[PDB]
Amino acid sequence: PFQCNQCGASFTQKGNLLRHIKLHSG
Amino acid sequence: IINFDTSLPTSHTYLGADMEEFHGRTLHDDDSCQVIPVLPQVMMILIPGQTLPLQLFHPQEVSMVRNLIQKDRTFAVLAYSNVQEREAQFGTTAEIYAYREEQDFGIEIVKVKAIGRQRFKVLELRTQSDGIQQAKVQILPECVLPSTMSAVQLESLNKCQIFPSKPVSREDQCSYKWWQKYQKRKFHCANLTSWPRWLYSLYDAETLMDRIKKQLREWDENLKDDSLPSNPIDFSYRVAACLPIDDVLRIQLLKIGSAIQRLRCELDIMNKCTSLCCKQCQETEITTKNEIFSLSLCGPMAAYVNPHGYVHETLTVYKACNLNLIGRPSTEHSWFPGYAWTVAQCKICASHIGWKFTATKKDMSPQKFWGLTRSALLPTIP
Amino acid sequence: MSYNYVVTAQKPTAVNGCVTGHFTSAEDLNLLIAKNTRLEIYVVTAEGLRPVKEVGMYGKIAVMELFRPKGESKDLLFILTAKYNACILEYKQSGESIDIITRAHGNVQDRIGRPSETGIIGIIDPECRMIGLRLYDGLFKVIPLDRDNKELKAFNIRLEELHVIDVKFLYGCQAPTICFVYQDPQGRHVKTYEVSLREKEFNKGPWKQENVEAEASMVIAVPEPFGGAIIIGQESITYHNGDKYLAIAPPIIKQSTIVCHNRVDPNGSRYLLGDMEGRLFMLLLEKEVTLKDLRVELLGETSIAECLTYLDNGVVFVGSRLGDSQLVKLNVDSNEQGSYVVAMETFTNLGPIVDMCVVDLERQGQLVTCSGAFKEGSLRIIRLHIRTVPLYESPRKICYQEVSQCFGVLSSRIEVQDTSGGTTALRPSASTQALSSSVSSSKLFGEEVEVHNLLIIDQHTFEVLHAHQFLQNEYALSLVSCKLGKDPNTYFIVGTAMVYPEEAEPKQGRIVVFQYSDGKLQTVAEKEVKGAVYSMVEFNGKLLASINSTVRLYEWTTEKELRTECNHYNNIMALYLKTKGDFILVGDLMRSVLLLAYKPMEGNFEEIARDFNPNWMSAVEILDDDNFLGAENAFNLFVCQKDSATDEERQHLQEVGLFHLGEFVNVFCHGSLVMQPTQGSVLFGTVNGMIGLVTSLSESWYNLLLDMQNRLNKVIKSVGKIEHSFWRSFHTERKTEPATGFIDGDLIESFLDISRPKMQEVVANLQYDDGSGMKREATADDLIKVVEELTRIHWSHPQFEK
Ligand SMILES: O=C1CC[C@H](N2Cc3cc(NC(=O)c4ccccc4)ccc3C2=O)C(=O)N1
Ligand SMILES: [Zn+2]
Ligand SMILES: [Zn+2]
């Protein structure tokens, strides 16, 4: 379901989504 | 590499199987001025002979690619020196050889596969009203130089300039007792000049290619002599594509017009040892050049497209150090058929480094390997 | 500067072809010798060779053959040049007037094609029906020899074999038949074809065979009554004629490779063979209608032969590229072997010139060059008067020490590894027969190694006073003679490199400082470096040495040592290094020109300008502060200049001069007054043994000489009707361009050889910019006065014919 765009599926948690979001920009 | 067809990743089955294939060639004249459209989202340095997959979502690139389909199927990829300000002085010409349109999710999507053809110099960066950049382009030449002895050779020795075929195929070490004979016979006219035989060997395409092949076979033992191209220009382009170097070195290699100079530069690049580290921390080692191996017919580094059209340049390595694994294996949209993947991030800074590929079966070899993206790696030269 | 003047001081002396026939008349036996761009015609008499005619051609001669079609009283000459200019020439004599008449001419170049690896091959069939040319791989070019073909029109026939070694026309065939040897992945094969002029096609040949050995290179067509072909390889000689097969493997020819041959008897009973080391062989064919056996015997030693020719009385002409050409006599009896040869005449050859220097400039310079290779190596003193000093080994570099009254010469000799683990010498040479000897260090199958030596030679007697032998696997590359720092002594400085067969790039080298005093050579200091010392030069009391892709300025310490001052790292190999003041000119083999400047107050190097154009470059020189001269791929010369009318264009060197010379230049020297309007004087030496001069001209003189060139090209008749503009055009495989910025002094000096009416034709309606200021209609005498000076710049050639 919820997963990244600059990387593979990251659907472990709702927190993980935005963690990867600011992670990818940084 | 046993029971895995290395031709599988090259065909890009994950994109589709019923693509429309166009066979043809359109080579521009040398030192000619041309106007070519530019893809607005691509930020990759394409070397001639490399394959680029693309997924296009916005309507304007869809319409521009549709227009390009009957107008010689050529678009320009700009090598950005610094990607922030979008300034580029050199680029490459890409030809479309596979395309297909879908209507899923109520919007139109075009999938394109392209191959690099020619190099050029950026003159004028014209911008159109619809957001597609038109570029004034000067087509750079490929310099084919004759043998160094063609200006000095004796006519009586012209019949002896042709050698018997290279001795019975060796597999490792390659004892020569032939490269010595080849040096003695090909550059025998060197005593007519001021320079010795080995200096002329340092500018010989065949010897440079053999040295490069030996150094490549040192790291990956499954190379065969017929896997690499037999033409100096194609060989140099393939080697420049396969080397783990940063963007400035790739631009410098693209700026060279002669194949011999490119081969010499590539040998110089190979000689200096490199270690690949995480870019955000710059203090944790991921992998070394020794673990680089080629699971694909086109070297250990290739361009692939993820389900959202974003392009990653993946490097296939055997052993990866200091990588944390999060997620479960999944076979959806895998670039390597028969393998799943789990995302891998740097253990220290948690940045996305690549993926870990695990075989579903037990008869597959290699059972596991790691693929790391180039943009998250920097070459550390001690 | 941007306008230059090139003249020839010494004509080329290397022989690249020789033929025999009846060219002057039906009763005279003629020898035709092809030196570079020069054709010499001789009449063979009992006492030797009588020169008759000498002509210059607008091209490099690649093919020279003599043929006599039906209805012709005497032979005709076919010439093909490296720029693919073909002509058929006739000899005409009306009293004292000797003319070379062009019967047909044309250009046979193909716009699309790859030049063949084994060169240009030109063959004429025995019945004079067609000319066959192999210029590009996969194509065979046929020129029909009908009388109404004045433009030399040809057609192409497709060859399915791409790698052809040799091809010849066969004797005794009712149709034009060719026999050739080609290589495929399976090996080397011999095949025959029939050429049809009606269908412009290849037909099936009379036979075919595979038994040709893996190292077969020569095809010899045997005349009647034998017929067939003879294939020469490294260990075997084979005869093929249909179902006839004869093979011999003589042990004597295993030591070296046969490269040249010539027919002795008209019916092919005897042949002459020449190998790479100067041995002369005789091949004898025994008959009984058909061939019975093949025999090879050794005659003796001659010069290293490029071509051989028999002169119908036991006299053989040996044409050499690495040494002097000879006339030799074959005797029925002999000294120590069977059928020895005796030398009776020697002709001077200065090629190849690998280095030279200018000496004795107090008052009239002299030129000392390093000529020849292997056993023909020698020192030539040119004053033209030429003196020969035989060395019997290869000379590499030369320099002059005035305080010691001696020359420093780098040399190399070939030695073979014996069973003991050491090395043994093939012949006595100057390095082994020296008055005194020294070795850097003494150390311990049947393969050749190179031994490098430094020789001290007296300037008066040219006797070897000292020989110094370098280390094992050491290669000496550069040599200078200079004073350094505040030391009042003059030193010999040598830059070497350590070369091992398993290492592509040398990782070690050294710079050695020698002093010659009290009859002996002593080592003062040595410096170990991490690369090859390709070039060294003296720079304002400091030493400038090119260490691979970097350069290293060195200081001379009061402790007699070398201390590093500054390092500049480049991306190119510094093969060429020239200096003028505070400017350094750096170049590589790929024609990458780099200009550096030394900043004395900062103590480092700065980059001024550059020009990177991928080609093959053989030499560079600095003309003045702004202009630089070089030699290009093929046989061209170029001039680059600086600051000519932002920092982007100030860092760019652009081309102001292009010229096609026809020679391969190895060395540039500043011979200001070697031979005692023009500014500067630069000499160059070529592979062909040619010496030339380059000088600078002002704009007005350049314009006047260009106009005179254009007017002269309309009245001078060229041999083969070749255009001077096409001949002098800058030529590479990817680019052809007109010449600019260069004046051909040979054509200007030809003005004095023409008749007075032709002089008035040339000078008609020409404006003379006299130094007085007012322009007026020039007369012939004014231009005669002007050309005089242009000839005085160098010496004058003597008469050739009797
Ligand atoms: O080996 C591999 C693995 C890496 C790479 N990716 C990237 C990827 C993103 C995604 N998210 C998505 O669709 C998605 C869907 C809805 C909302 C947001 C995102 C799914 C699968 C993959 C996937 O497989 C690939 O294509 N090849
Ligand atoms: Zn992410
Ligand atoms: Zn990190």
Side-chain angles (χ1 to χ4, degrees), chain B residues 141-148 150-165 176-177 180-181 184-185 188 190-200 202-203 211 252 257-258 260-261 264-265 268 271, chain C residues 16 114 117-119 163 165-166 183 185 188 215 217-218 234 259 276 306 321-322 352 354 374 396-397 447-448 450 475 477 499 501 504-506 534 571 573 575-576 588-590 592 614-616 633-635 664 666 687 734:
Chain B
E142 307 282 344
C143 310
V144 182
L145 282 186
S147 181
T148 327
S150 319
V152 211
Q153 53 194 54
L154 303 321
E155 312 91 85
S156 34
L157 278 43
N158 280 343
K159 309 166 316 333
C160 309
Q161 273 321 63
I162 291 197
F163 312 110
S165 323
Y176 60 117
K177 299 309 117 211
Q180 249 195 63
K181 254 192 64 41
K184 287 202 41 67
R185 186 97 74 71
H188 170 250
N191 38 83
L192 266 58
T193 76
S194 33
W195 296 117
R197 240 177 275 129
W198 43 276
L199 183 91
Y200 287 112
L202 294 178
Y203 291 91
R211 274 163 77 202
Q252 178 202 339
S258 187
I260 290 159
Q261 268 156 345
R264 288 178 53 76
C265 206
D268 204 276
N271 275 4
Chain C
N16 56 87
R114 179 89 317 181
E117 286 328 339
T118 89
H163 309 314
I165 325 287
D166 210 25
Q183 204 190 189
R188 303 224 166 151
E215 297 277 4
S217 51
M218 260 173 53
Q234 278 234 28
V259 287
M276 258 181 184
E306 174 74 27
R321 298 209 92 221
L322 305 188
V354 294
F374 310 120
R396 290 263 96 197
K397 305 284 178 184
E447 88 175 5
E448 317 185 335
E450 276 201 83
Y475 208 106
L477 282 162
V499 176
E505 259 182 309
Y534 297 112
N571 271 77
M573 259 181 183
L575 296 194
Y576 305 110
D588 86 322
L589 215 68
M590 306 227 56
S592 306
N615 212 9
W616 295 123
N633 183 39
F635 311 97
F664 188 95
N666 268 320
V687 165
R734 15 172 296 199

Side-chain angles (χ1 to χ4, degrees), chain C residues 156-349:
Chain C
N156 281 5
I157 311 160
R158 248 203 83 251
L159 259 174
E160 214 212 11
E161 292 82 24
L162 305 168
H163 309 314
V164 173
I165 325 287
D166 210 25
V167 56
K168 283 262 183 333
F169 271 108
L170 292 185
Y171 286 91
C173 294
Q174 250 208 349
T177 301
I178 54 156
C179 174
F180 64 100
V181 171
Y182 69 97
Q183 204 190 189
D184 65 355
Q186 278 92 264
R188 303 224 166 151
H189 314 257
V190 71
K191 195 173 184 181
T192 67
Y193 272 135
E194 290 191 343
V195 198
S196 184
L197 282 182
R198 270 169 29 51
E199 331 198 277
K200 317 189 161 171
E201 211 194 17
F202 274 142
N203 289 344
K204 212 216 182 321
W207 37 270
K208 147 116 164 152
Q209 168 73 302
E210 191 263 8
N211 269 356
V212 7
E213 84 157 63
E215 297 277 4
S217 51
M218 260 173 53
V219 173
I220 305 171
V222 187
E224 291 292 85
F226 302 120
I230 280 161
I231 323 285
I232 314 270
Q234 278 234 28
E235 45 275 332
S236 78
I237 298 173
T238 36
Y239 172 76
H240 296 94
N241 193 3
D243 38 351
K244 195 50 144 154
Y245 187 61
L246 216 79
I248 64 163
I252 35 174
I253 70 161
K254 257 189 201 43
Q255 270 135 51
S256 181
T257 317
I258 307 293
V259 287
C260 46
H261 77 270
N262 198 234
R263 202 206 304 155
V264 168
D265 316 83
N267 75 290
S269 302
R270 293 182 291 156
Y271 283 88
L272 288 164
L273 304 167
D275 80 333
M276 258 181 184
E277 325 173 317
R279 295 200 204 89
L280 192 63
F281 291 100
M282 188 77 103
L283 175 75
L284 302 115
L285 277 66
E286 180 173 1
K287 81 214 261 209
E288 46 91 43
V289 197
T290 49
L291 216 78
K292 203 223 218 163
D293 207 12
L294 269 176
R295 224 178 92 228
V296 181
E297 73 174 30
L298 172 61
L299 299 180
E301 181 137 89
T302 66
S303 295
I304 304 175
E306 174 74 27
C307 32
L308 298 158
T309 281
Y310 184 74
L311 259 50
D312 214 17
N313 212 259
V315 185
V316 181
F317 175 76
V318 178
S320 183
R321 298 209 92 221
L322 305 188
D324 286 343
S325 304
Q326 298 177 315
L327 275 182
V328 300
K329 180 108 167 43
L330 320 170
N331 295 278
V332 202
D333 284 333
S334 43
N335 324 328
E336 327 302 337
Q337 275 61 215
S339 308
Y340 249 94
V341 323
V342 185
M344 65 202 235
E345 221 150 308
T346 281
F347 311 102
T348 165
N349 172 31

Side-chain angles (χ1 to χ4, degrees), chain A residues 3-17:
Chain A
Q3 31 176 353
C4 272
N5 297 301
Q6 312 296 347
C7 53
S10 50
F11 63 100
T12 312
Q13 196 58 243
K14 202 39 38 203
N16 153 262
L17 260 304

Side-chain angles (χ1 to χ4, degrees), chain B residues 155-320:
Chain B
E155 312 91 85
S156 34
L157 278 43
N158 280 343
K159 309 166 316 333
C160 309
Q161 273 321 63
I162 291 197
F163 312 110
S165 323
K166 176 161 189 348
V168 291
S169 168
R170 252 276 199 102
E171 278 168 52
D172 54 298
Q173 194 265 108
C174 313
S175 47
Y176 60 117
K177 299 309 117 211
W178 178 79
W179 287 106
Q180 249 195 63
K181 254 192 64 41
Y182 171 91
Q183 206 196 238
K184 287 202 41 67
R185 186 97 74 71
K186 191 170 174 178
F187 309 115
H188 170 250
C189 305
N191 38 83
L192 266 58
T193 76
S194 33
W195 296 117
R197 240 177 275 129
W198 43 276
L199 183 91
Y200 287 112
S201 296
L202 294 178
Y203 291 91
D204 191 58
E206 291 286 317
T207 315
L208 294 162
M209 290 171 36
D210 187 45
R211 274 163 77 202
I212 283 177
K213 269 191 284 224
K214 275 174 183 26
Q215 285 222 39
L216 291 185
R217 200 134 38 75
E218 209 101 343
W219 312 341
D220 192 61
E221 302 47 29
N222 295 53
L223 272 60
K224 288 295 160 297
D225 198 9
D226 49 6
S227 74
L228 277 314
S230 301
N231 205 247
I233 318 178
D234 295 358
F235 186 92
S236 68
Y237 282 137
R238 172 84 83 81
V239 169
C242 95
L243 278 165
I245 57 184
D246 79 316
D247 262 19
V248 293
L249 286 164
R250 262 157 100 115
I251 291 166
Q252 178 202 339
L253 284 174
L254 206 81
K255 293 220 215 70
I256 295 164
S258 187
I260 290 159
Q261 268 156 345
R262 218 178 283 121
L263 289 167
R264 288 178 53 76
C265 206
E266 277 148 5
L267 260 165
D268 204 276
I269 287 166
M270 294 189 216
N271 275 4
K272 46 173 37 63
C273 310
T274 88
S275 79
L276 305 180
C277 265
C278 153
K279 149 185 301 312
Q280 231 66 18
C281 307
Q282 315 198 2
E283 73 177 357
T284 288
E285 189 167 75
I286 301 296
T287 197
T288 68
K289 57 159 102 43
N290 329 312
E291 283 316 71
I292 297 177
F293 95 107
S294 152
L295 204 84
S296 147
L297 199 64
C298 282
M301 206 156 75
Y304 309 109
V305 152
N306 85 327
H308 277 290
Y310 301 2
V311 178
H312 298 278
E313 287 166 304
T314 318
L315 178 88
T316 46
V317 297
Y318 257 107
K319 209 192 198 63

